[PDB]
Every structure is written in structure tokens, then in C-alpha cells.
A paper describes a structure:
The BBSome is a cargo adaptor that recognizes a diverse set of membrane-bound ciliary proteins. It binds with its cargo to the intraflagellar transport (IFT) complex, a large heterooligomeric protein complex that is transported along ciliary microtubules by the molecular motors dynein and kinesin. We recently reconstituted a heterologously expressed core complex of the human BBSome, comprising the subunits BBS1, 4, 5, 8, 9, and 18. Here we report the structure of the human BBSome core complex at an average resolution of 3.8 Å for BBS1, 4, 8, 9, and 18 and 4.3 Å for BBS5.
We determined the structure of the BBSome core complex by electron cryo microscopy (cryo-EM) at an average resolution of 3.8 Å. The BBSome core complex is arranged in multiple layers with its smallest 93 residue subunit BBS18 (also known as BBIP10, BBIP1) in its center. While being almost completely unfolded itself, BBS18 winds through two super-helically arranged TPR domains of the perpendicularly arranged BBS4 and BBS8 subunits, and clamps them together like a U-bolt. The resulting Y-shaped arrangement forms the spine of the core BBSome complex. BBS1 binds to the N-terminal end of the TPR superhelix formed by BBS4 via its N-terminal β-propeller domain, wraps around BBS4 and BBS8, and binds with its C-terminal GAE domain to the TPR domain of BBS8. The N-terminal β-propeller of BBS9 binds to the N-terminus of the TPR superhelix formed by BBS8, in analogy to the BBS1/BBS4 interaction. BBS9 wraps around BBS4 and parts of BBS1, and engulfs the GAE domain of BBS1 with its C-terminal GAE, platform and α-helical domains. The BBS1 β-propeller is located at the periphery of the core BBSome complex, and – in the absence of BBS2 and BBS7 - is freely accessible to bind to membrane-attached Arl6. Importantly, this orientation also leaves a negatively charged cleft in the BBSome structure oriented perpendicular to the plane of the membrane. We therefore believe that our BBSome core structure represents the open conformation of the complex in contrast to the autoinhibited closed state of the bovine BBSome complex.
Residue numbers in the entry:
A (entry chain I): 642 to 800
B (entry chain A): 249 to 587
C (entry chain J): 26 to 80
D (entry chain H): 285 to 505
E (entry chain H): 63 to 77
F (entry chain D): 168 to 423
The structure:
Amino acid sequence: LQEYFELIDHHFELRINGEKLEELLSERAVQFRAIQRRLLARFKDKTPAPLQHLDTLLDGTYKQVIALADAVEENQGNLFQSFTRLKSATHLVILLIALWQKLSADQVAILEAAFLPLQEDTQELGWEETVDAAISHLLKTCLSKSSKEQALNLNSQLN
Amino acid sequence: VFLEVSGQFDVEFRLAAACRNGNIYILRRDSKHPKYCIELSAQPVGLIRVHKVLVVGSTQDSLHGFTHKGKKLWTVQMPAAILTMNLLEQHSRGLQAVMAGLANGEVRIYRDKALLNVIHTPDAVTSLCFGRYGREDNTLIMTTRGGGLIIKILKRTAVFVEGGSEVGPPPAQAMKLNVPRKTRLYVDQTLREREAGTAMHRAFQTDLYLLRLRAARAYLQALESSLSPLSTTAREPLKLHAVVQGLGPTFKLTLHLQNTSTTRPVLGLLVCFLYNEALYSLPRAFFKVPLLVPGLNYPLETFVESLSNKGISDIIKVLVLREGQSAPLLSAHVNMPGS
Amino acid sequence: VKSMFREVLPKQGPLFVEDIMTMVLCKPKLLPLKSLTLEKLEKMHQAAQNTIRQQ
Amino acid sequence: LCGIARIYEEMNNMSSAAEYYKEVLKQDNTHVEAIACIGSNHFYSDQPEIALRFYRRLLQMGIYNGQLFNNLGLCCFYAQQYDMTLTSFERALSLAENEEEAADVWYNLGHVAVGIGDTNLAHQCFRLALVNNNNHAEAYNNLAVLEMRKGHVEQARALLQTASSLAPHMYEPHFNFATISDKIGDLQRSYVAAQKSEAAFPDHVDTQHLIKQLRQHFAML
Amino acid sequence: GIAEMMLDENAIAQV
Amino acid sequence: DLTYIMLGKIHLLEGDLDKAIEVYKKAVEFSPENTELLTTLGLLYLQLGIYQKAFEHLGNALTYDPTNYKAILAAGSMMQTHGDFDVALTKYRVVACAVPESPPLWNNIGMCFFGKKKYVAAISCLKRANYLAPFDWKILYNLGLVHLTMQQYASAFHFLSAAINFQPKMGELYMLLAVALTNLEDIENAKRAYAEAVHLDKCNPLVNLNYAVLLYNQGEKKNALAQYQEMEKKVSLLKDNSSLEFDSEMVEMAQK
């Protein structure tokens, strides 16, 4: 459970860097939609709209929307590649708690869904927002004497 | 934070003080403990005494009054927020009045229960005194909230009256019994109802009797198929929508689950959507739903990848874990025609 | 002696004595009537699906 | 004269809109799109008999839609003419074009069913409007007033929860949330509920008797 | 015939 | 003061008002200037049956504050139970520019026009309430009562039967609905609807037994005077049995 706590952090920091490469592309896409609307307000076949201020400035903000577009997938592909690491960890943890005290296979069945949202892009789904919310209401009417998730309840809200 | 004294010594000494806890504390001559305590509902904004009664100002704008021992005597409500309170004392007339610098800019003046006058002119006043300034004996200095000054001077001829008119409740004729007018086109309709009305009653029932049948034959036509987004056994509803980013060949479909229990977390259900095969993919197509906590709503997102321009409705189901394939809460989502 | 026909009505009603905070419903809506351009443009677009349903 | 009374309805200047639509009917007594927009602005504000006269005449031109047999059904009921009030709905259930369109005729049938008092009938009129079309935001609210009449509080408070998220205007779920969630005692969500029932419709009466009911609780006792 | 802003109903708002 | 009305909330919720008045009688004693404590006391006297004290307490609240909406309808109801219909509307017009859409308000002004025999005005005024609040106990029973006076018998079945569904235990709705049937032709339903009418009250009203003789006037002779002598003595009521006694003079004329 200590070694399990290392993998949940650097995945979440990769989700934090996943939550860091997204807002820079959006405002530059807002810059990219503003420059299109500056074109279509200007682009007409007569004198006061120059053909300059219409081509070369377009490419630099076009280079803005692609120089991170190939980079937002690398961490996100590694996010999915670390999500299998996160599940195989939390499968390994949930096997031991089923046998650390002997569990009647229904207690692990509630835990088989409490720790396990099988998600792909959990940035709007909140895997980290689920696992604390699941164990929040789980504290009542499952069983007593189990202190490992009670210790994990401390690490839950403390990220 | 607010205190005053009646002012006597060596035989008797009353020391009153208001505090941050919204109380009124008074002190005797030599007993160094609060002998009598009286409370308000909120913070007093000012503590001024009169010749024998003592007034406070609540921040709920309810200017009270308490006697020497301290009991409830009278209460004047004020139509704006109190901001400053002070004492009026004329050496010539002997008048003991209390000021109230309101928030809109007026300065109301009060005796025991009577409004004496008001001064409507400046903005919001924070500071206020009333005394002699220099040679003149009647000066009531005030101060703007921005930092400027405004000075008033009383004259010797003016003595303070009530001089208040009888402001009634409603003297305006804004709405004199607003009732719509019924024309000739209604008064001929009551004659059709008066004589031939007995045929109209039996016409309603036998048309309504088909209506109960036509509804229930179409209600049970979908309840057995469980098309409704509401359930009773497993107690969640299901709302779903096409999101703004879902436009063009790509298309994004959200889905909203939320339990309606207080303490019963439903556990590990299954969401699958059978659909007539158009040219889109939806690569996952069969999830395992997380543990629904009672109270939170869950966003569940997919990715329709349509290749060309068509439109055909999806049906999204949710099942119980293993046994019941009866598929509650199947929502026939009608799709938008993309390009 | 023709008929009595005396059915005396109470001539009084249950006046309210206070307002009660209650829940109110959405009000019924009259559907709009589509224009003769919207009737034409929908009819043209409805036939635009069937000519691409075969091609 | 139709273009000038169309921008007045954009600012809701019906004091000066419906006089111009009395001129496009003064001459040109068969213009179709200025017959409804007077015959609707009389059905509201309590002239449900005059508004019928503008719709039986629009039938006799011979247009024969499905939308008109809805409007003809509603005006005869509120004018208390019980013969044509319901046959006009059964012809409106038939000859309906889309499946999203037969929802709205089931929904207006629900307001009929509340009028006779039958709630069991009324409970399956909004439901069939809801299974024929989801995201019908006016029915989610309207179904879960009938739930609160029975007692299903947690069932009702989720339908108003999803009626609001479909219509982020239209004050009626927002205020209706803050008389369920006020009777329980949750005075924090029952403020943000009755906050949006002021911004989406000011000059409401029973919102201003509710925010000042809450703001006395928030200051002190 | 029944609209003021983003398809809202009437006779409970005004008019 | 705020500790009082939560204590007053207790005795109304559990049961009677008789102990609850003395909670408020202590409450008016400590603060005779607060209008909110007076107005709730005024409605509590009125539900007991007024001994003219309720008229006093509302006027104390009205002089201390003249625009309190809850205070006006009580005195609006208080005047209207005797007469003073022209006086009642003058009170009501004060508040109608403040609460332009209130269904308890618009029911009363509709019922006030019913006193002055402006019959066609009331239905145009009551139906502004039934649009605004679709189900009520009181708006529907008022709206059906004005139609039977106007002899519009076919429409009055629609509203009277629309208020049976919302509260079944009433007696007088069952009384009037039977009169809405005999002007139609459902005499089989008329004896059935009257059968649930005479059972659901068992003590208070005396008008419906005078209705029993009019149904019994057609093709029946035995149990007429049995219904006529049934509960002939009134315990304590100020209702107008004298107008029925003119009709009961014709009832005893059938058996003499």
C-alpha cells in the first residue's frame, strides 16, 4: 500500500500535466477562431483589404495549434498506458485485502467496483474524484475492523 | 466597542457598554461586575442615552430604547441601513434628540417616538457632531463618504416641530380593479350552453372514455418495453444529450446517471447500447458503470465517429448485474443528422 | 301546483383566509404554425434523404 | 406592416405590436401569419373565446396541419366548449409528422387531464410525452409536481434537478426546487435554486417572499 | 404565438 | 420573539389551537407592536370562530404597518363574511398592484363580485385563478357554484366533479353535484351520488336533507317526511335555513 501510493501520484501528476496541456491549446484556438473571423470580415475582392495580413500571420497561429496537438496525445497515451499500471496495482491491492482477513466474496464484490471504474479518458469522469467519493459512503454498513482503507481514507482526501 | 456614562460620582455611577457579542452591559458604582445584562438580535451600531431612557441601533434597522434598569419601551423602524448615531443637545432650548445618519444620504432626527425633520441633500454621511462652532452656537457638522465636507447652520427663529403630514397607504389610482372585459362573443355562447347543454355532457364522457383506453394501450406498449427513463426498483433516472463539441463527422455523446436514494449505493451495473448499424463505430460500446453514490450525478461520455451524412436513433440501455436482462431505463436517444 | 323546482343554493363560498406557498406547473403551450417556406424547405429536405438512401 | 410588428415582438412591445397586426387584418383579411399571432395573444391574458374565433376561421381557409388541431383543442377547453375540445386532439395525435411532434400533443393533453382532476390519467400523459421525446424540459417539471402530491420527495427532486439542466432559462423548475429543498431545511441549495428564479424571471412575487425569507436566516437568528 | 426568449411560455410571466 | 412562533409551530402541528393561543397571548403581551405576531394570532382566533377579538388584532397590525399583504386578506375575508362588498374591494385594491397574480386574492375578488350580482364578471375573474393554480380545493368549488346560479348546468358538472378528485371527504360538493345531475338526465347516477352525500357528513349540514325531498318528490311518497324530520334540530349554526324553510314549507305541504 505504500508502494501503491507512488503510482497513484505520478499518474495524477500526469493527469495534472494532462490538465496543463489542454488550456493552452483552447485559448490559441480562440486565437485561431478570432483570426478566421478577422479574415472573413476582411476577405473581399476590392482595395482596402490587403492580401498581406491575411496569409503569413495565419501560419504562425496554425503552428500554435499543431505544436501541442502532437504533444497532448503523448502524455494521454501514456496516461492510458499508466492506467493499466493503476488497475493492475489496484487489482493487486484488492486481492490482498480479500485474504488479509477472510472475506465472504461479497465484501470484495463491493470493493471490486469501489476501486475500479474502467475508464479511458477520466479527465471529465474523475477517477480520483470517484475513489474518494466511493469510499466516503462506503464507511457505513460494509464490515468493521478493516483499517487499511481507513488509513487510505486519510490518503484519499490528501491526494 | 460602544459605551457611555450617565454621569454622576461618589453616590451613584452607571456605566453602560455595548460589545461585539451583541449585548448591552451596564455597571454599578463600585460593584465591578455586570449586574444587569440585556441583549439584542444583532450588533448595536451606536449607543446614545436620552435624559432617562437609553437607545441603541441594530444593524437590522430597529432603533430600540431601554430604561435605567433596562426594559423594552419603544421601537422605531428605519427604511434604510443605519450608519451613524449621535446625540443632539441644544443649550438654549434644552432639547435632547438622537441623530441617525442613514445610508442613502438623509439624516433623520428623532425624539422619543417622533420624527422631527430630515435633510435629504448630500450623499452617504459617516461622521456627525452637533455643537457650537466658533462664535455661532448652533452647528451640526457632517461629512461625505468620499471625504468632502458639508456644514449646516440652524437659525434662532426655527424651533423643531413634528410638522409631518398624513402619509396614507394607497392614494394612487394605479390599478382600479383590473378585470378583463367580456364581449358579445361570450354572451351568445352561454345561450348555446343553456338549451342544448344536455347533449354536450354525454359527448364529453364517451370521447374521454376512448381517451383513457388510447392512453393506457400506448402506455403499456412502452412500459413492458421499459422505454421510460424512470424506474422504481433500481432507483436512478437517465438523461442524455448531444454536446456542443459533437459536430461534423466526429460526434460526442454524454450521459447522466445519478442515484435517487439517500443511503443505498447501487452497485456495479452495466450500460450497453444496441443500435441499428449505420456507418459509425463507437469503439467501446459496452462499459462497466462505477459505483453510484447517493446524490452525485455522473457524466459518461462516448465518441461517435460517423463517416457520412445520415441520421438514425440509438437506444441506450442499462442492466442489472447478472440476472435480470429486462433492461430498465432504456432511453431511445434520437440522433441529430451530422454531415 | 305545476312544480316546486326549489333547489336553494348556498349563495356563499369558501373564501381564502391566507396565502399558502405552493408549487405551480408549467403552462400549456400553443404550437406555432410553420411558414410556407418552412413547409417547402422541410418537404424538400425530407425528399433529400430518400434520394441518398438509395445512392 | 408585418415587418414592423415583428420587431416589436422581439422586444415584447405588445402594447404597440398588436395594433399593427390589427391593420394587416384590416385590409388583407386572410394573411395567415397575422391571424395566429393575434389568436394566440388573446388565448393568453384571458380571452379564450375570441382566440377561438381566430382559429376556426383559419381552419376554413383549408390548411389542415397537425399543429392547428392542437391549438384548436386548447382554445375550446379553456373557453368551456366541451364538444370539439377532444375530438380535435385525437385528430391531432394522428397526422403528426415526427415522433418528437406527437409528444407535444400528449403534453397539452396532460393539462386537460389536470383540469378534470384525474391524476392517474394525467400521470401517463406527461410520461408518454416523455417516452416519445426525452429532453422535453417542460414535462419533467410538470410530471414531478404530481409526484410531490403523492409523497415521493427524492423522486421529485431529481426530475426538477434534470428539468433545470435541460432549460437554463425558464424560471419554473428553479423556483419549484426551492419549495421542496426549503421544507426539508437545506437553506444553501435552496438559495442558489431561488437565485436563478430571480435572474431568469424578475418581478416574481413568490421569489421575493423567499429570498427575504432566507436572508433573515443567513444574517443571524 | 407563444414565445418571449429561448422558447418560453406565457400567462405566468405576463400578458 | 422568534422562540415563540417555533413553539407555536408545535401545537398546531400536533393538534388543537386552544393551548396554542395562550402561547401567542403571552407573545402579544411581550411585544404588542410586532405585526407578524398579531396577524398569526388573528387567523388563530378566526379558526376558533370569531368572538369579535380577531377584528381588533388585525387593525393593530394594519395601523402599525399598512402594506402587509397577509394582514389585508384576513380583514378582506373578515368584512366579506357579512357584507360590505364595496368596502372589501377598497381593501383589496390596495394590494392588487403589489401581488398581481395571487390565486387566493383572485378567488376572493371573484367571490366579492358574486355578492353584487355581477355574475358575468366573476367567471372572468375566477378563471384567472384556475389558470394560475390548476388544482385547488376552493377555486374549483367556487367556479362550479356560480354556474348553477347562471343555469349553465352542463359546464358546472365539469368543475364540481373536478374537485371531488382532490378532496373526497366533502359533503357539500356531493350535495351540489347531485343538483348538477338532475338538470341533465342521469337519474340513476343521481340516486347513487346522493347516497354518498348523506353519509359523509353525519352531523353538520341541513340543506341536503331538504334536497332529499325534491328527489323524493318524483315517483316516491313514503320516506319523504322521514328525510324531512331527519336532523330537523340545529345544534348551533347561523346559516340561512329560513330560505330553505320556504322550500321546506312546500316539503311539508307534500305530506299534510
